[PDB]
């Protein structure tokens, strides 16, 4: 009923940015909030009127345009480092309770040169755990990525699994000293010893990275660090 676009953006200090919202459900009201740890959800701009806008609690550094009843858009002329937050779009009927979009993670940085996709690696379960508890834990490690815009998933024999899985809620800084430090994320997949012992079983750790877009300039030697998937595979051992 409510869709946000883009789902993720890496922008540059000074660059022009545009976040779009498209309501499939007809509503008079549409809002744009930014979510911040400590501040919570704060309003930037809203629209009562299908073809005009009104300023929220923090309109500073923002511009918003509602050219349709169904389309409310957020615009930043000079993307500031301050503007990095998760943005939420919500539409409501005046009487009605809000319906929310899934949100867009926007990251304004100094150098797109800091952008890197992850390195994924699968670590085989220990024979010690295999004997002691008759269970086998596989570890996945996604390292050296910037920004922390990743989604990790496990795939057993071509199907996505959720049971016996646990992923870190938030990633962790590799060099906590540096401001623009790269990240690391771990995940655990626990199977029964039998399931790992079987060499015919296939385990895959999938990492969806969100980085640069097609339109972003890349004047560097290394591969453009665009939005992509990075995987690591494993088969049982006896």
């Amino acid at each position: 009923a409510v869709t946000q676009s883009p789902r993720s953006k890496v922008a540059v200090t000074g660059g022009k940015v545009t976040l779009s919202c498209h309501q499939t459900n007809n509503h008079d009201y549409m809002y744009w909030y930014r979510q911040d740890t400590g501040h919570g959800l704060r309003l930037i701009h809203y629209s009562y009127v299908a073809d005009s806008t009104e300023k929220g609690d923090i309109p500073d550094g923002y511009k918003a345009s509602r050219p349709s009843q169904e389309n409310f858009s957020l615009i930043l002329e000079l993307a500031s480092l301050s503007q990095t937050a998760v943005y939420f779009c919500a539409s409501s009927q005046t009487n009605s309770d809000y319906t929310f979009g899934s949100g867009t993670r926007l990251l304004v940085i100094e150098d797109l040169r800091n952008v890197f996709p992850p390195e994924v690696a699968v670590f085989e379960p220990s024979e010690a755990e295999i004997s002691h508890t008759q269970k086998a834990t596989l570890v996945c490690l996604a390292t050296g990525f910037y920004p922390d815009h990743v989604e990790l998933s496990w795939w057993v024999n071509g199907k996505e699994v959720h049971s016996g899985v646990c992923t870190d809620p938030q990633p962790l800084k590799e060099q906590p000293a540096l401001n623009d430090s790269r990240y690391a994320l771990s995940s655990r997949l626990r199977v029964s010893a039998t399931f790992w012992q079987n060499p015919r079983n296939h385990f895959r750790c999938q990492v969806q990275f969100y980085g640069l877009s097609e339109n972003d300039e890349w004047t560097q030697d290394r591969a453009k660090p665009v939005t992509q998937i990075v995987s690591a595979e494993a088969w049982g051992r006896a």
Partner: protein
Amino acid sequence: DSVTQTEGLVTVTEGLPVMLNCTYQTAYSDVAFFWYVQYLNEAPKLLLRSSTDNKRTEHQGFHATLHKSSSSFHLQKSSVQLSDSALYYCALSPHNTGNYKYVFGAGTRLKVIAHIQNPDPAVYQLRDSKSSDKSVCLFTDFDSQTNVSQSKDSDVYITDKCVLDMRSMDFKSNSAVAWSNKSDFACANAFNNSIIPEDTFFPSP
């Protein structure tokens, strides 16, 4: 005009109750009150709403009763579950004023922790599948009352505990991971910085 929620993080073990406070300050009389839940990376979704004083609302074992007299709209639950770990927003909305807009509180993050009936702490070493020289130390099977802490070394990385559930075995387990590149990194030396149990199994092998 003003919505005030409990500050920080609320850690509760599964099966136990919870109370997430929400007090407000509004000039208006006809007002709608809300609780929205936000599960990791998903949109905030309505959980409970009421506009009538003293009436109790129930949803997923989550109740809230409006107390206009003390400006209270607390969120409660008698027996919390692991799926209840989320960020909870308390909200206020004055009806019949023209321009409809919410007034949110800062939010309260609830973290729910597993009840481990049969623990057996251990630190195993895992090896990489491709080109097997890299290693990770797996600290697992400890009770929820064990807290993992980050290393005093800048070359060592330690992730916080995280429960996983094997639905088939009705079995749940806490795990924490440690890795480093440096030659000075042992699995026996990996979780010294943390209060690890006396009966922590360390394989020779």
